[PDB]
Symmetry: C3
Subunit: 109 residues, 3 copies
């Protein structure tokens, strides 16, 4: 078959450490809010806070799910994330491997 552009998205989420990242990744995949999560360790986050530059050690999550599920995914991550304001941003997938994209929709449907 084909693929509807933008029907699948990749969401990025930053976590304070590997333990937290793994906990949320397993939960969202089990709850079928996502089909796949890639964890990238050893990240350093830089931003301004209280008039000073902060450099933190974090883990970055790349989450592949149905674009229509991102709101629910964001609600879940927000409810269990240790941060008061968790970074969750999602980008639409326009092209790719159809059987893979088809799989993302099925296991999350």
């Amino acid at each position: 078959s084909g693929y509807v552009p933008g029907s699948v998205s990749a969401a990025f989420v930053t976590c304070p450490n590997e333990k937290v990242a793994k906990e949320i990744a397993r939960a969202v995949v089990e709850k079928r809010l996502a089909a796949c999560v890639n964890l990238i360790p050893q990240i350093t986050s830089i931003y301004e806070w209280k008039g000073k530059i902060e450099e933190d050690s974090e883990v970055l999550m790349m989450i592949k799910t149905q674009s229509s599920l991102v709101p629910a995914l964001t609600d879940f991550v927000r409810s269990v994330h240790p941060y008061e304001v968790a970074e969750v941003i999602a980008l639409p997938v326009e092209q790719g491997n159809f059987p893979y994209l088809q799989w993302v929709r099925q296991v999350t449907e």
Copy 2:
């Protein structure tokens, strides 16, 4: 003058660095892509036959013309060890024109 979306960023997951490098080199050699960024030590968590699984992998970020994503995907699945290779591409809307221009020329 960059045409929004004419260049795309594609993400591919490989089992190990050896495979990632072979595919990455072939892709640039064959001009299906201008550049490939390999991110080692990735942990993937996904479903498989109803059960949750965890694998150690390498993530590839490939930049190329959006028009070439289909050819790139076909090639990646031809030599990728997995049955269903992860290949997703996101459109680039803005950036550094000279670089975006270069991506176009080498592919």
Copy 3:
């Protein structure tokens, strides 16, 4: 949240020293809310008919889409390479409070 009003831009640098210098500067000048540094990247590209493999650092920058042009000019002015890699992708969804924060600090 207005779809596409925030973007994530990627920039690669030769080492963590340059990446951090550029990251701290864009945040300081409020050209971006935050930057995530991904260390130990291997870049494979062609140049002069040969395949190169360099060790590098990847930067993921979150800012207002309207700020990408300025962010790009600044990066190009302080970046060590002649032709710096800077590509931006629009954010269509996400956690509204985080997205609004990005707009606020920039």
